[PDB]
Structure formats: C-alpha cells, structure tokens
Amino acid sequence: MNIFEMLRIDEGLRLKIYKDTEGYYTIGIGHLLTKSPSLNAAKSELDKAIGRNCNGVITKDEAEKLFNQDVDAAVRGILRNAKLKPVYDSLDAVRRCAAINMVFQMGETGVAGFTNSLRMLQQKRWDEAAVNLAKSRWYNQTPNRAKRVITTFRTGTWDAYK
Ligand SMILES: [Cl-]
Numbered sequence: 676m677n678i679f680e681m682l683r684i685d686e687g688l689r690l691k692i693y694k695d696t697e698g699y700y701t702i703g704i705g706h707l708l709t710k711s712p713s714l715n716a717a718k719s720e721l722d723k724a725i726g727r728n729c730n731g732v733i734t735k736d737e738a739e740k741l742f743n744q745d746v747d748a749a750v751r752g753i754l755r756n757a758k759l760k761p762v763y764d765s766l767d768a769v770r771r772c773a774a775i776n777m778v779f780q781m782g783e784t785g786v787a788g789f790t791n792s793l794r795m796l797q798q799k800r801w802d803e804a805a806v807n808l809a810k811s812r813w814y815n816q817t818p819n820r821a822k823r824v825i826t827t828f829r830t831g832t833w834d835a836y837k
Contacts, residue, residue, distance in 0.1 A: 705780075
C-alpha cells in the first residue's frame, strides 16, 4: 500500500465528468473541477487542466497524470503550511498517508482547522485523536472513508484498506 493506492481506493476512477459527494463537478480520481453549478465552467476547467478540448471526457493516462499532480499538490501544501508541517513531520509514513488523504479531500485550509486533532496526533495520543477526528462534519458526511482514514491514524497500519 501507498498513498496512490489508498486514494485510488477512496476516490475511484471515472473518465467522464461526475459530481462528488458535495455535488461538485469532478473527474478522474477525485479531481475537483469547480464549485460552480455551471457544467460549461467545469468543462473549461477540464480543458485547461488537460491542455486540450476534452468535451468532459479524459483517458486513463490523463486521469492518472492529474492524480499524480493532485497528490503532489497536497504534499506541498502540507509542507508550506506552518500548522500542518510540524504535525506531518512528527508522523510515521503510514500516518503521513492519512494526513495527505485528508488534505486531498478537504484542502490545506480545511485540515489546518483541525487544531485539537492535530495536537493530539503530534502528541501521539492515537485513540484520543481518533475520537476527536470523528467529531466533525467530515466524519458525519463521509463516515466510511473517514473511518478508514481514522483507523489509519489510530493503528499506524493499512488494516482498514486490506
Ligand atoms: Cl463515506
């Protein structure tokens, strides 16, 4: 297991524009296109991201390339954020994957607001962090995915994904 396999499981793969769990236009392996309700706006974002006129459809190679860029952007967002970087650097490799997963799903600013969870993670209070992470809109709106991510923080293993 690695971060790419973990997020591929959590996000799936769809080659045509779809709506994510929040109702936002998305493509590929969970690549958000826009929060605008305009499908044309989503199609313009797609063409810009891919570099060609796609008509709302991409290839699997294109989906995987977008996915690699998106994972890297999540990592670089963590490393440039004064609240997230110290927690990230305190974690082992498996738990770092759980952190990237959260930033991929909710964005750097969203995860940076989990101030008390982040402190408990940095203190390595895993069960306490797990309880605190579940007290969130995130857990309530996507409970199966949040439970997998939280189990990864709690145990430091890939057991939720096996
Ligand atoms: Cl879910």
